[PDB]
Amino acid sequence: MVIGRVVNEMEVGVPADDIWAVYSSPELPRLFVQLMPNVYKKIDILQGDGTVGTVLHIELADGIPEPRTWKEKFIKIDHQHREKVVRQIEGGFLDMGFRVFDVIFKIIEKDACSCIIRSTTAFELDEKFENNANLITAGNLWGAAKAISNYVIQNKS
Amino acid sequence: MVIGRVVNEMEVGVPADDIWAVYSSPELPRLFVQLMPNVYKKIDILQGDGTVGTVLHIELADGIPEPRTWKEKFIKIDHQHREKVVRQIEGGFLDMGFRVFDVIFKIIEKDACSCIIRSTTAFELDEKFENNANLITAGNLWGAAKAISNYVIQNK
Predict the structure, then answer these.
(1) Quick one: B2-155 is in which CATH superfamily?
(2) Which of A141, B3, B46, B99 is the most buried (most CB within 10 A)?
(3) A118 strand-pairing partners
(4) Residues B72, B56: contact at Cβ < 8 Å?
């Protein structure tokens, strides 16, 4: 099997708690559609109150390369460590040879007034489909870090 | 800056020493061209004997996306930890907003007869070129892992 991860890190000049408050917020499914229309077309909440166990249905914008639709589940929201794990559970990359497809957001304290958004995409991929690993790029989830940090910064202004 | 890395891991049923012996070998530049001509068209040794400080000039095969040419340098060959670090020093991704562009091969012993090839591509990228992060994909260097593992396995 192909075991793989991509990671990017964004430094943000606000405290970690202020960024984690939004990444962990159950309102995030709405903010993705609201703030990133070129990425997220429609997100439905299928089950749950926004805490662990919540299931979403994702539809990406027209013309974005496949996969554009899937169901995902919030499987970890660790407030201690400011780490959120979201796992695809139906469709999406699971129909393209991936046996596991996780996205992990970790908000790292840099100092009292700045933090790092670490966005990890981690997967296990059938070797018969190894070329699909090239669909996963080091820029994955950077746009979301940019949109969420911008939302927090400008609202403080 | 964009701080970023991609990593893939291949399990291989031979001892770590046998895989590290080839990844760390100064013959590796020749094996890349010999075994993967669809990727590496030409690799010249510009300076050095294969140890730390050795500089190579890479030309990728036609049809591979830009950037196709660069110079790189072996900046670490850690035999104790089985880790090799190769840094681009001219051209390559340095012409596309990347300020640091490293490739790291680490051979991880699992048990006496099996290991993991961990191939990491790690970079720092200017945010004016932040979209160029999408040029770096999770499959990077997987083909080299296939070629070297096969070379070691079949030769045993």
Answers:
(1) START domain (3.30.530.20)
(2) A141
(3) A9, A106
(4) yes
B58 in Cβ contact with B72 (< 8 Å)? yes
- What are residue A137's DSSP bridge partners? B137
Resolution (A): 1.7
Beta bridge partners of B87: B73, B102
**B84: closest CA among B122, B111, B46, B135?**
B122
> How long a stretch of residues is chain A?
157
- Give the gap in angstroms from C-alpha A139 to the nearest C-alpha of chain B: 5
CATH fold of A2-156: Alpha-D-Glucose-1,6-Bisphosphate; Chain A, domain 4 (3.30.530)
Instruction: Name which of A6, A110, A130, A132 to mutate to probe chain B: the one with the most chain B Cβ atoms within 10 A of its Cβ.
Output: A6
- Residues in chain A whose Cβ is within 8 Å of chain B: 1-11, 121, 123, 130-131, 133-139, 142
**Cα separation of B91 and B72, whole Å?**
9
Residues 6+ apart with CB under 8 A from B143: B36, B39
Q: What's the CA gap between B127 and B2, in Å, rounded?
A: 6
Number of helices (H), then strands (E), belonging to chain B: the values are: 3, 7
DSSP of B21-36:
HHHTSTTHHHHHHHH-
Q: Rounded CA gap, A116 and A111, in Å? A: 10
Pull the structure tokens for residue A86.
Answer: 């979201």
DSSP A11-46: EESS-HHHHHHHHT-TTHHHHHHHH-TTTEEEEEEE
Single-letter amino acid, residue A124: E
Give the residue extent of every domain in chain B. 2-155
